[PDB]
Short mmCIF file of C-alpha atoms in Angstrom, two decimals:
data_model
loop_
_atom_site.label_atom_id
_atom_site.label_comp_id
_atom_site.label_asym_id
_atom_site.label_seq_id
_atom_site.Cartn_x
_atom_site.Cartn_y
_atom_site.Cartn_z
CA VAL A 1 0.00 0.00 0.00
CA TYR A 2 2.97 2.42 0.48
CA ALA A 3 4.32 1.83 -3.10
CA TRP A 4 1.72 0.11 -5.39
CA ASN A 5 2.11 -0.43 -9.17
CA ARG A 6 0.09 1.89 -11.52
CA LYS A 7 -2.36 1.18 -14.39
CA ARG A 8 -5.18 2.51 -16.61
CA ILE A 9 -7.65 0.97 -19.12
CA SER A 10 -7.33 1.19 -22.96
CA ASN A 11 -10.93 1.19 -24.36
CA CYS A 12 -11.40 -2.37 -22.94
CA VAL A 13 -14.76 -4.14 -22.28
CA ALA A 14 -15.54 -3.24 -18.62
CA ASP A 15 -17.93 -6.09 -17.56
CA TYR A 16 -18.00 -4.57 -14.01
CA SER A 17 -20.83 -6.90 -12.75
CA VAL A 18 -17.98 -9.42 -12.07
CA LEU A 19 -17.32 -7.55 -8.74
CA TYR A 20 -20.72 -8.89 -7.48
CA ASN A 21 -20.57 -12.21 -9.45
CA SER A 22 -17.07 -13.47 -8.39
CA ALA A 23 -16.84 -15.23 -4.98
CA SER A 24 -13.39 -13.81 -3.95
CA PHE A 25 -14.63 -10.31 -2.84
CA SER A 26 -14.08 -9.35 0.86
CA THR A 27 -14.14 -5.48 0.82
CA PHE A 28 -15.93 -2.80 -1.28
CA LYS A 29 -16.49 0.93 -1.95
CA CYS A 30 -19.13 3.05 -3.73
CA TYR A 31 -20.13 6.54 -4.93
CA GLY A 32 -23.03 5.49 -7.28
CA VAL A 33 -25.07 2.43 -8.46
CA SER A 34 -24.06 -1.28 -7.99
CA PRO A 35 -21.35 -3.14 -10.06
CA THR A 36 -23.87 -4.29 -12.75
CA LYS A 37 -24.73 -0.57 -13.31
CA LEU A 38 -20.93 0.05 -13.63
CA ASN A 39 -21.10 -2.55 -16.47
CA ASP A 40 -23.79 -0.19 -17.98
CA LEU A 41 -21.36 2.81 -18.11
CA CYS A 42 -18.29 4.38 -19.82
CA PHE A 43 -15.71 7.18 -19.18
CA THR A 44 -12.99 9.08 -21.13
CA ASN A 45 -10.58 8.43 -18.19
CA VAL A 46 -10.01 4.98 -16.61
CA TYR A 47 -7.26 5.01 -13.94
CA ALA A 48 -7.20 1.37 -12.77
CA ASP A 49 -5.72 -1.15 -10.29
CA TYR B 1 -29.53 14.74 13.10
CA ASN B 2 -33.40 14.43 13.06
CA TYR B 3 -34.06 15.60 9.43
CA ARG B 4 -34.41 12.51 7.17
CA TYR B 5 -34.37 12.55 3.35
CA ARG B 6 -34.52 9.64 0.81
CA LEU B 7 -31.32 8.23 -0.75
CA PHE B 8 -32.85 5.11 -2.42
CA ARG B 9 -36.17 4.34 -4.20
CA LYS B 10 -37.36 1.66 -6.68
CA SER B 11 -38.39 4.53 -9.07
CA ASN B 12 -38.49 8.37 -9.19
CA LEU B 13 -41.62 9.91 -7.55
CA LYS B 14 -44.07 12.16 -9.51
CA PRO B 15 -44.87 15.94 -9.20
CA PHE B 16 -46.45 16.72 -5.76
CA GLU B 17 -46.60 12.90 -5.08
CA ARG B 18 -45.57 12.60 -1.37
CA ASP B 19 -44.12 9.26 -0.12
CA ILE B 20 -43.42 8.31 3.57
CA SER B 21 -42.45 4.63 2.76
CA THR B 22 -39.42 2.93 4.47
CA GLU B 23 -38.97 -0.33 2.43
CA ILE B 24 -35.39 -1.73 2.11
CA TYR B 25 -34.12 -1.73 -1.53
CA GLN B 26 -31.76 -4.37 -2.99
CA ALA B 27 -29.24 -2.81 -5.46
CA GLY B 28 -26.81 -5.69 -4.62
CA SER B 29 -27.46 -9.37 -5.52
CA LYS B 30 -28.55 -10.46 -1.97
CA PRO B 31 -32.35 -10.54 -1.19
CA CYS B 32 -31.66 -8.84 2.19
CA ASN B 33 -35.44 -8.42 2.76
CA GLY B 34 -35.80 -6.25 5.93
CA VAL B 35 -32.08 -5.72 6.91
CA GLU B 36 -29.08 -3.88 5.32
CA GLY B 37 -25.97 -5.47 3.68
CA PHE B 38 -23.93 -5.41 0.41
CA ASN B 39 -25.67 -2.68 -1.64
CA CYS B 40 -29.01 -3.16 0.21
CA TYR B 41 -30.23 -0.16 2.17
CA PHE B 42 -32.89 1.37 4.40
CA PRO B 43 -34.10 4.23 2.16
CA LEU B 44 -34.16 7.20 4.61
CA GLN B 45 -30.99 8.80 6.10
CA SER B 46 -30.53 12.25 7.76
CA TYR B 47 -28.69 15.57 7.44
CA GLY B 48 -26.14 16.47 10.19
CA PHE B 49 -27.14 20.14 10.58
#
């Protein structure tokens, strides 16, 4: 967390509903609708994990 | 902290159409059905004036 690697998306297919569908999730954050609604969206910037 | 307003609803309300209802809404995949959890919420929360 003190020195993470950096990334951003490149017009890729953001099927964001996978954050609710995959079993591995153990923490979350929000400032809008659920992950399936994030799969119903797009943005001109995409700074990413 | 007494002044409640509505953060979640199943649909937008109509002109002059008042609504007191307090039903939990499920934006997340879990049918939480009367309690909160992953993206499931009690619809009224309050200002901290």
